[PDB]
Design an enzyme around this catalytic site. Structure first.
Site, PDB file in Angstrom:
ATOM      1  N   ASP A 192       0.839  -1.196   0.000  1.00  0.00           N
ATOM      2  CA  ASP A 192       0.000   0.000   0.000  1.00  0.00           C
ATOM      3  C   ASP A 192       0.885   1.262   0.000  1.00  0.00           C
ATOM      4  OD1 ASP A 192      -2.771   1.179   0.540  1.00  0.00           O
ATOM      5  OD2 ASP A 192      -1.593   1.992   2.225  1.00  0.00           O
ATOM      6  N   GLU A 219       1.799  -0.562  -4.822  1.00  0.00           N
ATOM      7  CA  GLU A 219       0.798   0.419  -5.224  1.00  0.00           C
ATOM      8  C   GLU A 219       1.658   1.677  -5.297  1.00  0.00           C
ATOM      9  OE1 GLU A 219      -1.786   2.451  -2.373  1.00  0.00           O
ATOM     10  OE2 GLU A 219      -3.409   2.433  -3.861  1.00  0.00           O
TER      11      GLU A 219
END
Ligand SMILES: [Ca+2]
Length: 556
Positions: free
Chosen positions: A199, A253
């Protein structure tokens, strides 16, 4: 040599909270996901990436973690998690989990300790700084509203949070903190997880001294946050102390980074990450403020894909996706979700997704052609990001509540979070209770039960494409060449490998169109088509396309 399993795999993304509820509290859970593995196996799914499943107060639905070694109460117990892994393994499937280590919840014990005083052992697990000129340490804004700096009267200093106020950023400049994160990753890898998705991986390194962003940088502050000077040093250290010892695939990401920097994260020789999740394509028509949409054409769409494919180069690798939990629904965003075109365009987008060079990720519900949700009021949104837009734009007088609603209805992350539509029973069979987020009323026409029983459905098309991709190596690891990047009507490209070449042609217009193959190229065989009344004849040098028609052909 063979390509790693992940380069030819088809992934499915499950947002647990909205996939399947098995105890009537209106929230999806592990037992629900475990109960549907045969459904996913039947579609042809090789691996699943699940959103955050750890202990969390849920201010950002899982992305604010209060204990990295405990399961989220709403999803079940560690036993439930272990059973999910055992059942995936029985089916030869693999699990990719979400790793959120740019920040923790403010309820994490490290933060409760950190904030208590200026001199404790955990003070530097986060960023605490004195304000300046009577206000915050600098002009950094938060993605979720207001300043990225929050004052704590206990010490009088401010702590950093790029995201929500309840998501304080972890301090990677502190070796002891880095080591704690590495031990945490090993805890999950030791359990057998096959992949990890990092993330907001590009924001880990912070800029020393925290100077103010310039007026230009302020325009796109997301980019400045990915320019920390120690970013790659930290990613390489993580690979060296963790990933080099396991055989899990890692994906990042890469939010906010300029595309030209992506190779630094994925070039296999650099020993950082294996695959890249970029935002260039999915946000290709999003304004800088993230809640308005800018008109684009297929030429912009394919040209972006071309740029992204080029950065993977020889040693890098890309994931490919048209939807996820942070964006509007694929068919609504890239296709035409009107009743008469929804299925045709959803099939066309499936053809694109499953023939791109990279590892495709299918977001839950897109195999059914699920659409955006008809929000009526700002109260229909759950997402903290929308509350942030209200704070930054409506309370400040920059826009009216009506303008925010009108525009955010087309871009909100909540469009992708409405409950998966299993059948046409109460709340589409997602729950026997009251769903945490309203089910789209179109579940009466869009639901898994109906799709599975219809060979002409979107679901059946996805299933057929997945089989075709699985049997055709060129469609996963083959080279990619856009036949005409300037064409804004029909998207056409080839995939080639070991002398075998395939042609993909997709009409993005709701009108008939013609396509002329490259000189010397001829159709040899038709593998599959959607919305076509007839396949071309062997040897054809051109194709006549129906509105939204898509097809994959072997050429000669
Ligand atoms: Ca539940």
């Amino acid at each position: 040599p063979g390509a790693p399993w992940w380069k030819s795999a088809v992934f499915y993304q499950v947002y647990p909270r909205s996939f399947k509820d098995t105890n009537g509290d209106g929230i999806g859970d592990f037992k629900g996901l475990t109960e549907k593995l045969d459904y996913l196996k039947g579609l042809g799914i090789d691996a699943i990436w699940i959103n955050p499943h750890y202990a969390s107060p849920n201010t950002d639905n899982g992305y604010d973690i209060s204990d990295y070694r405990e399961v989220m109460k709403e999803y079940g117990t560690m036993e439930d998690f272990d059973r999910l892994m055992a059942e995936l393994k029985k089916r030869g499937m693999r699990l990719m989990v979400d790793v959120v280590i740019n920040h923790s919840s403010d309820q994490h014990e490290w933060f409760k300790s950190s904030r208590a005083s200026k001199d404790n052992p955990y003070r530097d697990y986060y960023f605490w700084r004195d304000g300046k000129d009577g206000h915050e340490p600098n002009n950094y804004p938060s993605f979720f509203g207001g300043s990225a700096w929050e004052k704590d009267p206990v010490t009088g200093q401010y702590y950093l949070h790029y995201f929500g106020r309840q998501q304080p950023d972890l301090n990677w400049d502190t070796p002891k903190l880095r080591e704690e994160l590495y031990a945490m990753l090993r805890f999950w890898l030791d359990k057998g997880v096959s992949g990890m998705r990092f993330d907001t991986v590009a924001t880990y390194s912070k800029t020393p001294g925290f100077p103010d962003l310039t007026p230009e940088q302020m325009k796109n502050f997301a980019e400045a946050y990915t320019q920390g000077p120690n970013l790659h040093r930290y990613l390489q250290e993580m690979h060296e102390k963790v990933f080099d010892h396991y055989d899990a695939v890692t994906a990042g990401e890469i939010f906010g980074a300029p595309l030209n920097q992506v190779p630094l994260f994925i070039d296999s020789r650099r020993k950082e990450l294996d695959m890249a999740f970029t935002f260039d394509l999915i946000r290709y028509d999003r304004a800088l403020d993230r809640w308005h949409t800018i008109p684009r054409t297929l030429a912009d769409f394919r040209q972006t894909i071309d740029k992204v494919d080029a950065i993977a180069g020889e040693y890098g690798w890309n994931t490919f996706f048209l939807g996820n939990h942070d964006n509007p629904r694929a068919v609504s965003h890239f296709g035409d979700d009107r009743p008469q075109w929804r299925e045709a365009s959803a099939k066309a987008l499936a053809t694109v997704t499953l023939t791109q060079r990279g590892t495709p990720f299918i977001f839950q519900g897109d195999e059914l052609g699920m659409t955006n949700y008809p929000f009526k009021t700002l109260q229909d949104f759950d997402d903290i990001e929308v509350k942030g837009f209200f704070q930054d734009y409506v309370e400040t007088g920059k826009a009216t509540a009506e303008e925010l609603l009108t525009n955010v209805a087309l871009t909100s992350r909540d469009n992708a979070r409405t409950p998966f539509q299993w059948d046409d029973s109460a709340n589409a069979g997602f729950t026997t209770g009251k769903p945490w987020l309203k089910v789209n009323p179109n579940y009466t026409e869009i639901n898994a039960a109906r799709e599975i029983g219809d060979p002409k459905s979107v679901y059946s098309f996805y299933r057929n494409l997945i089989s075709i991709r699985h049997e055709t190596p060129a469609l996963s690891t083959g080279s990619y060449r856009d036949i005409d990047p300037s064409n804004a009507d029909v998207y056409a490209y080839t995939r080639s490998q070991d002398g075998e070449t395939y042609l993909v042609v997709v009409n993005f217009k709701a009108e008939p169109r013609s396509f002329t193959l490259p000189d010397g190229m001829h159709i040899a065989e038709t593998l599959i088509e959607s919305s076509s009344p007839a396949a071309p004849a062997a040897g054809a040098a051109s194709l006549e396309l129906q509105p939204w028609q898509s097809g994959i052909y072997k050429v000669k």
